[PDB]
Design an enzyme around this catalytic site. Structure first.
Site, PDB file in Angstrom:
ATOM      1  N   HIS A 200      -9.614   9.294  10.711  1.00 15.54           N
ATOM      2  CA  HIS A 200      -8.161   9.008  10.776  1.00 15.54           C
ATOM      3  C   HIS A 200      -7.936   7.940  11.848  1.00 15.54           C
ATOM      4  O   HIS A 200      -8.274   8.164  13.012  1.00 15.54           O
ATOM      5  CB  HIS A 200      -7.287  10.240  11.012  1.00 15.54           C
ATOM      6  CG  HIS A 200      -5.838   9.915  10.956  1.00 15.54           C
ATOM      7  ND1 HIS A 200      -5.101   9.995   9.799  1.00 15.54           N
ATOM      8  CD2 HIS A 200      -5.001   9.487  11.899  1.00 15.54           C
ATOM      9  CE1 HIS A 200      -3.856   9.642  10.053  1.00 15.54           C
ATOM     10  NE2 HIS A 200      -3.775   9.331  11.322  1.00 15.54           N
ATOM     11  N   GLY A 201      -7.382   6.806  11.445  1.00 16.80           N
ATOM     12  CA  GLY A 201      -7.034   5.744  12.395  1.00 16.80           C
ATOM     13  C   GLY A 201      -5.533   5.655  12.594  1.00 16.80           C
ATOM     14  O   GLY A 201      -4.793   5.876  11.639  1.00 16.80           O
ATOM     15  N   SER A 202      -5.110   5.354  13.815  1.00 13.57           N
ATOM     16  CA  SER A 202      -3.670   5.186  14.125  1.00 13.57           C
ATOM     17  C   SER A 202      -3.527   4.124  15.206  1.00 13.57           C
ATOM     18  O   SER A 202      -4.536   3.750  15.800  1.00 13.57           O
ATOM     19  CB  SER A 202      -3.004   6.468  14.549  1.00 13.57           C
ATOM     20  OG  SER A 202      -1.642   6.476  14.172  1.00 13.57           O
ATOM     21  N   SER A 242     -10.003   3.678   7.756  1.00 14.75           N
ATOM     22  CA  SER A 242      -9.221   4.293   8.809  1.00 14.75           C
ATOM     23  C   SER A 242      -8.997   3.288   9.931  1.00 14.75           C
ATOM     24  O   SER A 242      -7.866   3.156  10.393  1.00 14.75           O
ATOM     25  CB  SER A 242      -9.862   5.586   9.328  1.00 14.75           C
ATOM     26  OG  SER A 242      -9.712   6.644   8.379  1.00 14.75           O
ATOM     27  N   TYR A 245      -6.155   1.015  10.375  1.00 11.24           N
ATOM     28  CA  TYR A 245      -4.851   1.630  10.727  1.00 11.24           C
ATOM     29  C   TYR A 245      -4.710   1.739  12.250  1.00 11.24           C
ATOM     30  O   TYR A 245      -3.676   2.199  12.705  1.00 11.24           O
ATOM     31  CB  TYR A 245      -4.721   2.947   9.967  1.00 11.24           C
ATOM     32  CG  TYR A 245      -4.340   2.793   8.520  1.00 11.24           C
ATOM     33  CD1 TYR A 245      -3.031   2.546   8.153  1.00 11.24           C
ATOM     34  CD2 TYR A 245      -5.290   2.891   7.520  1.00 11.24           C
ATOM     35  CE1 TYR A 245      -2.672   2.403   6.826  1.00 11.24           C
ATOM     36  CE2 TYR A 245      -4.948   2.751   6.188  1.00 11.24           C
ATOM     37  CZ  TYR A 245      -3.634   2.503   5.840  1.00 11.24           C
ATOM     38  OH  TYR A 245      -3.285   2.360   4.524  1.00 11.24           O
ATOM     39  N   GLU A 330      -9.629   8.233  -0.427  1.00 13.06           N
ATOM     40  CA  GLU A 330      -8.449   8.546   0.342  1.00 13.06           C
ATOM     41  C   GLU A 330      -8.146  10.036   0.125  1.00 13.06           C
ATOM     42  O   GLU A 330      -7.994  10.477  -1.013  1.00 13.06           O
ATOM     43  CB  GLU A 330      -7.366   7.605  -0.184  1.00 13.06           C
ATOM     44  CG  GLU A 330      -6.106   7.565   0.638  1.00 13.06           C
ATOM     45  CD  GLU A 330      -5.175   6.447   0.205  1.00 13.06           C
ATOM     46  OE1 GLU A 330      -5.689   5.308   0.067  1.00 13.06           O
ATOM     47  OE2 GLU A 330      -3.950   6.697   0.045  1.00 13.06           O
TER      48      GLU A 330
HETATM   49  O1  LIG Z   1      -1.644  10.727   7.961  1.00 12.45           O
HETATM   50  C1  LIG Z   1      -0.503  10.269   7.767  1.00 12.45           C
HETATM   51  C2  LIG Z   1      -0.346   9.044   6.898  1.00 12.45           C
HETATM   52  C3  LIG Z   1      -1.133   7.919   7.161  1.00 12.45           C
HETATM   53  C4  LIG Z   1      -1.070   6.747   6.412  1.00 12.45           C
HETATM   54  C5  LIG Z   1      -1.941   5.601   6.734  1.00 12.45           C
HETATM   55  C6  LIG Z   1      -3.329   5.946   7.147  1.00 12.45           C
HETATM   56  N1  LIG Z   1      -3.559   5.948   8.420  1.00 12.45           N
HETATM   57  N2  LIG Z   1      -4.812   6.235   8.836  1.00 12.45           N
HETATM   58  C7  LIG Z   1      -5.916   6.530   8.059  1.00 12.45           C
HETATM   59  O2  LIG Z   1      -7.037   6.742   8.543  1.00 12.45           O
HETATM   60  C8  LIG Z   1      -5.659   6.511   6.634  1.00 12.45           C
HETATM   61  C9  LIG Z   1      -6.736   6.759   5.732  1.00 12.45           C
HETATM   62  C10 LIG Z   1      -6.412   6.725   4.376  1.00 12.45           C
HETATM   63  C11 LIG Z   1      -5.091   6.422   3.898  1.00 12.45           C
HETATM   64  C12 LIG Z   1      -4.080   6.196   4.790  1.00 12.45           C
HETATM   65  C13 LIG Z   1      -4.349   6.216   6.171  1.00 12.45           C
HETATM   66  C14 LIG Z   1      -0.217   6.686   5.334  1.00 12.45           C
HETATM   67  C15 LIG Z   1       0.579   7.796   5.052  1.00 12.45           C
HETATM   68  C16 LIG Z   1       0.540   8.976   5.818  1.00 12.45           C
HETATM   69  F1  LIG Z   1       1.403  10.031   5.496  1.00 12.45           F
HETATM   70  N3  LIG Z   1       0.555  10.903   8.325  1.00 12.45           N
HETATM   71  C17 LIG Z   1       0.302  12.085   9.152  1.00 12.45           C
HETATM   72  C18 LIG Z   1       0.705  11.825  10.579  1.00 12.45           C
HETATM   73  N4  LIG Z   1       2.123  11.644  10.447  1.00 12.45           N
HETATM   74  N5  LIG Z   1       2.988  12.020  11.383  1.00 12.45           N
HETATM   75  C19 LIG Z   1       4.092  11.620  10.805  1.00 12.45           C
HETATM   76  C20 LIG Z   1       5.422  11.802  11.441  1.00 12.45           C
HETATM   77  F2  LIG Z   1       6.160  10.743  11.146  1.00 12.45           F
HETATM   78  F3  LIG Z   1       6.077  12.908  11.088  1.00 12.45           F
HETATM   79  F4  LIG Z   1       5.287  11.916  12.750  1.00 12.45           F
HETATM   80  N6  LIG Z   1       4.000  11.022   9.609  1.00 12.45           N
HETATM   81  C21 LIG Z   1       2.722  11.050   9.393  1.00 12.45           C
HETATM   82  C22 LIG Z   1       1.960  10.505   8.211  1.00 12.45           C
END
Ligand SMILES: O=C(c1cc(Cc2n[nH]c(=O)c3ccccc23)ccc1F)N1CCn2nc(C(F)(F)F)nc2C1
Length: 353
Positions: A200-202, A242, A245, A330
């Site tokens: 998971h990347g952020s 990841s 991201y 994914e």
């Molecule tokens: O995981 C996610 C999320 C992440 C992405 C992009 C992404 N990123 N990174 C990765 O490695 C990765 C790997 C594969 C596909 C995509 C990714 C696209 C939609 C998503 F839903 N989320 C959980 C944390 N989170 N927290 C909130 C809030 F706003 F409530 F705080 N919204 C969220 C959304």
């Protein structure tokens, strides 16, 4: 007064993720206003209104209302979520990617409000400030050793699963932490099979929130079409997918990647995106978006009970006839209790040019 009691590598991690000034600079790059809307006085409610406005916009986009209706919905977002475009004339959100941009912005604002809160917290002067911040994470972070066996294996996971169409950079592992967030193992669905160690990347602005509160489910106010497979927690088996991201730059070539135990259970496999993938589970536990290359199987080890999908990667012979085909897999889970955070990689990005 008192000296830190933290290992130095943990002291550097804390210093890096709790850097409010760096968040300030990351939001400024997403065209946000850091003085008019000071991160120091961000509130959940400002962000909730944010999501609400993005929902109105989605509504216009779904209705094809790209005139006045959309113009006013975008202005309400730009009013509740102050942007600083200087002279530029604030543009319309109409595409999925424009929409996705805004969602990523609100997610970072949400994690920045968490971070600000924590760093402003008490300020008890018995302990070094790093030490306070680390306690306030309620998340153990244990520096592993370069020689350590774990480093060896995760290094190989990182390098072995770097995707070949992400040739814009390589990655060097500077440091490796074991993560133990308070409550995650107690919550965790140990019953479900098909437990994988996934990436998971952020953005660097989200780790305090991610480590302190865990990976969270997107709020009900957010638009569903923001999410290619619905409002869940998204992981890849390819390091670079990841890693993209993390939004690292040549000037900011230091980022963090997370490895989590993910209780996939039975995957609902999909070829194309579907924001409503979650209603299509029907008893299944996760969504798998299917790509053309993925780690083999024969290299898959295990590590504290999870299968590490080590590479090299290989063609999966997957292909979508009628539309887009994901390059890489994914995985989406729709409950935090299907995630147990395990490691945190400190990663240098070495950009080609
Ligand atoms: O995981 C996610 C999320 C992440 C992405 C992009 C992404 N990123 N990174 C990765 O490695 C990765 C790997 C594969 C596909 C995509 C990714 C696209 C939609 C998503 F839903 N989320 C959980 C944390 N989170 N927290 C909130 C809030 F706003 F409530 F705080 N919204 C969220 C959304």
């Amino acid at each position: 007064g008192p000296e830190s009691q933290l290992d130095l590598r943990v002291q550097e991690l804390i210093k890096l993720i709790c850097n409010v000034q760096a968040m300030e600079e990351m939001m400024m790059e997403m065209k946000y206003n850091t003085k008019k809307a000071p991160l120091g006085k961000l509130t959940v409610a400002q962000i909730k209104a944010g999501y609400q406005s993005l929902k109105k916009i989605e509504d216009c986009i779904r209705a094809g209302q790209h005139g006045r209706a959309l113009m006013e919905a975008c202005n309400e977002f730009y009013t509740r979520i102050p942007h600083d475009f200087g002279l530029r004339t604030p543009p319309l959100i109409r595409t999925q990617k424009e929409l996705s941009e805004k969602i990523q912005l609100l997610e970072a604002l949400g994690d920045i409000e968490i971070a600000i809160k924590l760093v402003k917290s008490e300020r008890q002067g018995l302990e070094h400030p790093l030490d306070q911040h680390y306690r306030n994470l309620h998340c153990a972070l244990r520096p592993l050793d370069h020689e350590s066996y774990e480093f060896k294996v995760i290094s190989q996971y990182l390098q072995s699963t770097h995707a070949p169409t992400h040739s814009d950079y390589t990655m060097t592992l500077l440091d490796l932490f074991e993560v133990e967030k308070d409550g995650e193992k107690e919550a965790f669905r140990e019953d479900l099979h098909n437990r994988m160690l996934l990436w998971h990347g952020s953005r660097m602005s989200n780790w305090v929130g991610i480590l302190s509160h865990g990976l969270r489910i997107a709020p009900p106010e957010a638009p569903i079409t923001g999410y290619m497979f619905g409002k869940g927690i998204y992981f890849a088996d390819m390091s670079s997918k990841s890693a993209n991201y993390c939004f690292a730059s040549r000037l900011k070539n230091t980022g963090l990647l997370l490895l989590s135990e993910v209780a996939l259970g039975q995957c609902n496999e999909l070829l194309e995106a579907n924001p409503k993938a979650e209603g299509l589970l029907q008893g299944k536990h996760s969504t798998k978006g299917l790509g053309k290359m993925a780690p083999s199987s024969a290299h898959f080890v295990t590590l504290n009970g999870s299968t590490v999908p080590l590479g090299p990667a290989s063609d999966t012979g997957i292909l979508n006839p009628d539309g887009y085909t994901l390059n890489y897999n994914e995985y989406i889970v729709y409950n935090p209790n299907q995630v147990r955070m395990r490691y945190l990689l400190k990663v240098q990005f070495n950009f080609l040019q």
